[PDB]
């Protein structure tokens, strides 16, 4: 298991524009296109991203290319974030993967405001952080996924994903 497989499980794969859990236009493996209500807008954003006239449908290969770029960007966002980087650097590999999953889902910004959880994580106070992370809108909206990520962070193993 690794970040890629892990996220491909949490996000799924869809080759036609779809609405995500928040009602936003998405495609591929969790690639958010736009927070706007317009599909035309979404379609425009897709075509710019892919570099062709897609008409709202992409191939598997294209989905994977967006996904790779998105994972890469999530990492780099963490490393560039003054609140997040030291937390991340302090952790082992499995737990770093849990953190990338979160930033992938919620944006660097969204994750950088879990101040309290970040501190506990950095202190290696796992059960506590786990409890704190569940006290969030994130957990109340997408509970099944949040638990998976939260157990991974908690245990530092991939059991939630087997
Ligand atoms: Cl893009
Ligand atoms: Cl979920």
UniProtKB/Swiss-Prot annotation:
Keywords: Antimicrobial, Bacteriolytic enzyme, Cytolysis, Glycosidase, Host cell lysis by virus, Host cytoplasm, Hydrolase, Viral release from host cell. InterPro entries: Endolysin_T4_type, Glyco_hydro_24, Lysozyme-like_dom_sf, Lysozyme_dom_sf, Phage_lysozyme-like, T4-type_lysozyme. Its EC number is 3.2.1.17. GO terms for cellular component: host cell cytoplasm. The keyword Hydrolase applies. The active site is at 11 (proton donor/acceptor), 20 (proton donor/acceptor). The keyword Hydrolase applies. GO terms for biological process: cell wall macromolecule catabolic process; defense response to bacterium; peptidoglycan catabolic process; viral release from host cell by cytolysis. GO terms for molecular function: lysozyme activity. Optimum pH is 7.3. Its main location: host cell. Changing residue 26 to H: Facilitates transglycosylation more effectively than hydrolysis; covalently bound substrate. It is an enzyme of class 3 (hydrolase). It comes from the Viruses. Induction: Expressed late in the viral replication. It catalyses: Hydrolysis of (1->4)-beta-linkages between N-acetylmuramic acid and N-acetyl-D-glucosamine residues in a peptidoglycan and between N-acetyl-D-glucosamine residues in chitodextrins. Belongs to the glycosyl hydrolase 24 family. Endolysin with lysozyme activity that degrades host peptidoglycans and participates with the holin and spanin proteins in the sequential events which lead to the programmed host cell lysis releasing the mature viral particles. Once the holin has permeabilized the host cell membrane, the endolysin can reach the periplasm and break down the peptidoglycan layer. PANTHER family: T4-TYPE LYSOZYME 1-RELATED. This is Endolysin. It comes from Enterobacteria phage T4.
């Amino acid at each position: 298991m690794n970040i890629f497989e892990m996220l491909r499980i949490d996000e799924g794969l869809r080759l036609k524009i779809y609405k995500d859990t928040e009602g936003y236009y998405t495609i591929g493996i969790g690639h958010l296109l736009t927070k706007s209500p317009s599909l035309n807008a979404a379609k425009s954003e897709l075509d710019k991203a892919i570099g062709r006239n897609t008409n709202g449908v992409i191939t598997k290969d294209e989905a994977e290319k967006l996904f790779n770029q998105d994972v890469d960007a999530a990492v780099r966002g963490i490393l560039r974030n003054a609140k997040m980087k030291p937390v991340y650097d302090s952790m082992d590999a499995v737990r770093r993967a849990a953190m990338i999953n979160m930033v992938f889902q919620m944006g660097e910004t969204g994750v950088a405001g879990f101040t309290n959880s970040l501190r506990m994580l950095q202190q290696k106070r796992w059960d506590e952080a786990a409890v704190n992370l569940a006290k969030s809108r994130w957990y109340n909206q997408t509970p099944n996924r949040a638990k998976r990520v939260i157990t991974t962070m908690r245990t530092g193993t991939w059991d939630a994903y087997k």
